[PDB]
Design an enzyme around this catalytic site. Sequence first.
Site, PDB file in Angstrom:
ATOM      1  N   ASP A   1     -43.664  51.194 -18.710  1.00 48.13           N
ATOM      2  CA  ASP A   1     -44.420  51.049 -17.478  1.00 48.13           C
ATOM      3  C   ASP A   1     -45.795  51.695 -17.423  1.00 48.13           C
ATOM      4  O   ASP A   1     -45.900  52.915 -17.415  1.00 48.13           O
ATOM      5  CB  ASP A   1     -43.531  51.617 -16.369  1.00 48.13           C
TER       6      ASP A   1
ATOM      7  N   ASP B   1     -50.103  46.694 -13.909  1.00 50.27           N
ATOM      8  CA  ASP B   1     -48.769  47.279 -13.986  1.00 50.27           C
ATOM      9  C   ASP B   1     -47.723  46.541 -14.841  1.00 50.27           C
ATOM     10  O   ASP B   1     -47.149  45.541 -14.405  1.00 50.27           O
ATOM     11  CB  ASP B   1     -48.266  47.431 -12.543  1.00 50.27           C
TER      12      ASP B   1
HETATM   13  C1  LIG Z   1     -40.154  50.278 -14.184  1.00 49.06           C
HETATM   14  C2  LIG Z   1     -40.161  51.165 -12.943  1.00 49.06           C
HETATM   15  C3  LIG Z   1     -41.170  50.693 -11.928  1.00 49.06           C
HETATM   16  N1  LIG Z   1     -42.446  51.074 -12.179  1.00 49.06           N
HETATM   17  C4  LIG Z   1     -43.419  50.706 -11.345  1.00 49.06           C
HETATM   18  N2  LIG Z   1     -44.676  51.061 -11.605  1.00 49.06           N
HETATM   19  N3  LIG Z   1     -43.231  49.988 -10.238  1.00 49.06           N
HETATM   20  C5  LIG Z   1     -41.962  49.584  -9.961  1.00 49.06           C
HETATM   21  N4  LIG Z   1     -41.830  48.838  -8.807  1.00 49.06           N
HETATM   22  C6  LIG Z   1     -43.024  48.522  -8.007  1.00 49.06           C
HETATM   23  C7  LIG Z   1     -43.563  47.122  -8.284  1.00 49.06           C
HETATM   24  C8  LIG Z   1     -42.569  46.012  -8.025  1.00 49.06           C
HETATM   25  C9  LIG Z   1     -42.705  45.247  -6.834  1.00 49.06           C
HETATM   26  C10 LIG Z   1     -41.803  44.196  -6.535  1.00 49.06           C
HETATM   27  C11 LIG Z   1     -40.745  43.893  -7.433  1.00 49.06           C
HETATM   28  C12 LIG Z   1     -40.588  44.642  -8.626  1.00 49.06           C
HETATM   29  C13 LIG Z   1     -41.494  45.700  -8.926  1.00 49.06           C
HETATM   30  C14 LIG Z   1     -40.855  49.899 -10.778  1.00 49.06           C
HETATM   31  C15 LIG Z   1     -39.460  49.428 -10.476  1.00 49.06           C
HETATM   32  C16 LIG Z   1     -38.517  50.154  -9.729  1.00 49.06           C
HETATM   33  C17 LIG Z   1     -37.215  49.618  -9.516  1.00 49.06           C
HETATM   34  C18 LIG Z   1     -36.835  48.349 -10.043  1.00 49.06           C
HETATM   35  C19 LIG Z   1     -37.792  47.604 -10.803  1.00 49.06           C
HETATM   36  C20 LIG Z   1     -39.080  48.179 -10.991  1.00 49.06           C
HETATM   37  N5  LIG Z   1     -37.454  46.327 -11.347  1.00 49.06           N
HETATM   38  C21 LIG Z   1     -38.438  45.475 -12.074  1.00 49.06           C
HETATM   39  C22 LIG Z   1     -38.646  45.848 -13.562  1.00 49.06           C
HETATM   40  C23 LIG Z   1     -40.004  45.327 -14.060  1.00 49.06           C
HETATM   41  O1  LIG Z   1     -39.969  45.064 -15.449  1.00 49.06           O
HETATM   42  C24 LIG Z   1     -41.191  44.585 -15.979  1.00 49.06           C
HETATM   43  C25 LIG Z   1     -36.103  45.733 -11.153  1.00 49.06           C
HETATM   44  C26 LIG Z   1     -34.987  46.769 -10.836  1.00 49.06           C
HETATM   45  C27 LIG Z   1     -35.435  47.813  -9.788  1.00 49.06           C
END
Ligand SMILES: CCc1nc(N)nc(NCCc2ccccc2)c1-c1ccc2c(c1)N(CCCOC)CCC2
Length: 333
Positions: free
Chosen positions: A31, A219
Amino acid sequence: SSVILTNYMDTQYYGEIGIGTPPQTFKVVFDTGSSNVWVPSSKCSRLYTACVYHKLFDASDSSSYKHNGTELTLRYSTGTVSGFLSQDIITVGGITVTQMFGEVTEMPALPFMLAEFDGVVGMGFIEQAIGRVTPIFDNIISQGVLKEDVFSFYYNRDSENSQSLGGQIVLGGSDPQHYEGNFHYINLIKTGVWQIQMKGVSVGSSTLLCEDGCLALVDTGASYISGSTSSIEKLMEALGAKKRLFDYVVKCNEGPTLPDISFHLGGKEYTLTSADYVFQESYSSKKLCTLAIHAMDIPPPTGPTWALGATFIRKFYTEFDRRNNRIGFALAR
Ligand SMILES: CCc1nc(N)nc(NCCc2ccccc2)c1-c1ccc2c(c1)N(CCCOC)CCC2
Ligand SMILES: *[C@@H]1O[C@H](CO)[C@@H](O)[C@H](O)[C@H]1NC(C)=O
């Protein structure tokens, strides 16, 4: 070094790392939107069902573990995790480095029960590290082994046949095998954040958004391309999309006709086709289809700002240049 990534439903991209001696394996998201490292802790109460469904790090099984205990809380725009700091040796595609990481003991059902990965590996700057912990990339560079102060991301379109790599991160350079044409750079507004200047956003034939300018956070940890509620509401209305609780939708039959969306970055139009931003899972008028563009208000200092996540990186191979504090895009292949 390169790390093979797995692509889960086009919304989650993660690879593997090893922690402790012997190595304890974990699935993690590289990330660029954060700067800390964390994985679930064996000390996480089983009352957190999310800890019951992920790999847990057990310090007492690692002979290389180094206690610290300092508490930390990591906040993402969609969820929070909390725990304490610990040190141990981490393996990332051939490279071995002693690293300080967070051992999470509080991991909320929503959204982590929906997480295919266990933890995260921040690829951001130390300026953004919670608890002032040195980021893993900074530590790897301190070994003078990488050929270059850069790392690149390749996110493949989801595949239905288990024989295509979900994605790939290159530590030290880029992989010409997954991009064509040459790179085009935009300089970071300020070092310490992978955020750049975006000259404008257009939907069809009318630069109706981000005129006068706006910011863009690149991001790799974000599933979609996002903008401020205001911006998105304006963009979505031009597409004829109806807002829901967590996303926007269009009648599936209308998907293919949606216009192009362009992002003006550093004097170069980056264009997406409807096929690029809509989850076309049907062609029926009696069904709704979600879009890979969401509304997400990011607070200062980072925001308000747009976010270029997986939806954008699938199309454009991305290089993060630390030595020159710039980001580079090229046609993904
Ligand atoms: C990798 C951690 C992470 N880092 C950052 N900078 N933003 C996140 N969300 C803020 C941005 C965001 C907004 C809307 C939907 C998903 C992420 C997340 C974050 C938090 C929780 C979850 C995420 C991602 N994911 C998506 C993984 C992405 O892989 C590439 C699914 C499971 C729950
Ligand atoms: C945890 O690591 C930080 C990093 O230098 C250090 O300052 C702190 O004293 C450590 N905590 C303990 C009690 O080991």
